[PDB]
Symmetry: C3
Subunit: 89 residues, 3 copies
């Protein structure tokens, strides 16, 4: 299993919020960070099985392209254990 983190610099921002939502990357979470002129950036994170890493990287890149794409970086790192809990509404 791997964690995928992407830090991307929106140009067409709102267009990229839409990109991210339309991308259909289930379980992805997003937060704002700043890089350096302080630059607002989006940070995306998701944990997937090893066999899914390239697929998710591709969806992130394709989403970024529909917006900016500008500058961005993606990191893949190991995950030892995951526990996922779902409760019906």
């Amino acid at each position: 299993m791997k964690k995928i983190e992407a830090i991307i610099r929106p140009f067409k921002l709102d267009e990229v919020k839409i990109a991210l939502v339309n991308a259909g990357i289930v379980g992805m979470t997003v937060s704002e960070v700043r890089g350096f002129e302080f630059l607002q950036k989006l940070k995306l994170e998701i944990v997937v099985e090893d066999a899914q890493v390239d697929t998710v990287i591709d969806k992130i890149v394709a989403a970024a392209r529909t917006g900016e794409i500008g500058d961005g970086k993606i990191f893949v790192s190991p995950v030892d254990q995951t526990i996922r809990i779902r409760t019906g509404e």
Copy 2:
């Protein structure tokens, strides 16, 4: 050593802020993230020795239960080095 990250979806939110504080998980940090209807979620992170991982996972789950528990996910990942600095006030 391991990093533990939990992303949890508050139902009884304020009740879960209280849960997290009462839990006594020393050094835990918390931030807000969003998942997808944008859903506000809490992200908790802590780094512990390997022998402490299950204990901390259990405290996080028990805290979540006092609030929602709803949906949540916990990831355990490796840490190579830690440096911790304390200065007296």
Copy 3:
């Protein structure tokens, strides 16, 4: 390659924003988190080659010193793959 995460507690805050900027740590991103009295903290993240880890740790510590330094923690963890994309403005 390694990810370096630092969570630091500003005393002379603004002085430490300046410290972080002056530090010249290219590509570092920063976000706010909270630890526990809720305490606002800064989280810094950067991914570097293994040979650069000590250099970056030293710059973070030196920056923290110009401000507080107070309390802080630094974690080094493995990274399997990085993809970095730059587009000219």
